[PDB]
């Protein structure tokens, strides 16, 4: 939102976990990942891409 990013350099896919476990616990999501990723339509980069709207995690300190 904010016009202001730095995107500093990030080798661990941490993101992946999330999105993994994420899918597990709502395995009816995944059809819709599916029906479009699985079709040939769009890429799992973009799936995602928008599923993580506002979806955040805290902080620890």
């Known amino acids: 939102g904010s016009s202001g990013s ?8 941490k993101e992946l976990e999330e999105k993994n476990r ?10 819709l990942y599916k029906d479009l ?3 040939q339509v769009i890429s799992a980069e973009e799936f ?9 995690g805290p902080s620890s300190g």
């Open 48 to 56: 995602w891409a928008n599923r993580l709207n506002v979806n955040s």
């Open 22 to 31: 994420m899918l597990q616990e709502d395995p009816v999501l995944f059809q």
């Open 37 to 39: 990723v699985v079709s």
């Open 6 to 13: 730095s995107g500093f350099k990030r080798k661990a896919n």
